Amino acid sequence: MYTLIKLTSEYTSRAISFTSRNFVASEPTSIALKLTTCDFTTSFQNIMKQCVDYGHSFAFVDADDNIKAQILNIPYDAYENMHYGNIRETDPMFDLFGNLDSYTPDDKCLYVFAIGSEVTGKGLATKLLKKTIEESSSHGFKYIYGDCTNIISQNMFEKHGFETVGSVKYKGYQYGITKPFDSINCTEYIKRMVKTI
Ligand SMILES: CC(C)(COP(=O)(O)OP(=O)(O)OC[C@H]1O[C@@H](n2cnc3c(N)ncnc32)[C@H](O)[C@@H]1OP(=O)(O)O)[C@@H](O)C(=O)NCCC(=O)NCCS
């Protein structure tokens, strides 16, 4: 069926594409901003590559080694110093997320940049999150942080012991005179969620 793997460098191109496509198709903030995969890859390919290279990311692959679900994780200290391919299309995204960067870890922390699954309702994302919790413990991380934009992942994180430490309401959020997130209907907040290991 599908095999749980630790992502390695040979999967980098597949990992970048998987999250780009998955988020552009199905993640609330990307959809709200009408991002294309070009927009997403430009802004986020660096962090996605680093999620693979730091060694703490996981995926489910099919028999032909295609990624069907993945979780891209990176140490928080690398996240805090991350560079992005900034473009006008994603400026409001960075503005929104920036609000959550005020709650910071006081010890070793693993940051979940992205979780996604193209084969849904089969437990794949849940299993990736549980694997990530095991990984965090094994490497002496004290916290896992995620900025979760989707009610589905918020509930999943809650089910696995995460607590909300910060939030921003989508409806009414402004970037200058624009209201770029008012189109979101599935989810009311973006939330920074923290699990203490
Ligand atoms: C969110 C996402 C990762 C879920 O992955 P998935 O593999 O279906 O999730 P799992 O099957 O492990 O299911 C996890 C839980 O979500 C629930 N769930 C999954 N899809 C759901 C849906 N469309 N509506 C309501 N609940 C849903 C499951 O029922 C399950 O809960 P339970 O076990 O308590 O019943 C997937 O929908 C996705 O990739 N979305 C685009 C990506 C995204 O937005 N990522 C998060 C950004 S924070």
Curated annotation (Swiss-Prot):
The keyword Cell membrane does not apply. Its EC number is 2.3.1.57. It catalyses: spermine + acetyl-CoA = N(1)-acetylspermine + CoA + H(+); spermidine + acetyl-CoA = N(1)-acetylspermidine + CoA + H(+); spermidine + acetyl-CoA = N(8)-acetylspermidine + CoA + H(+); putrescine + acetyl-CoA = N-acetylputrescine + CoA + H(+). The active site is at residue 27. Changing residue 27 to Q: 26-fold reduction in catalytic constant and 126-fold reduction in catalytic efficiency. One of its GO terms (molecular function) is N-acetyltransferase activity. It comes from the Viruses. It is an enzyme of class 2 (transferase). Acetyl-CoA binds at residues 22, 115, 117, 121, 123, 125-126, 149-150, 159. InterPro entries: Acyl_CoA_acyltransferase (IPR016181), GNAT_dom (IPR000182). Acetylates polyamines such as spermine, spermidine, cadaverine, homospermidine and putrescine (the latter with low efficiency). May play a role in the regulation of polyamine catabolism in the host during viral replication. This is Viral polyamine acetyltransferase. It comes from Paramecium bursaria Chlorella virus 1. The gene is A654L.
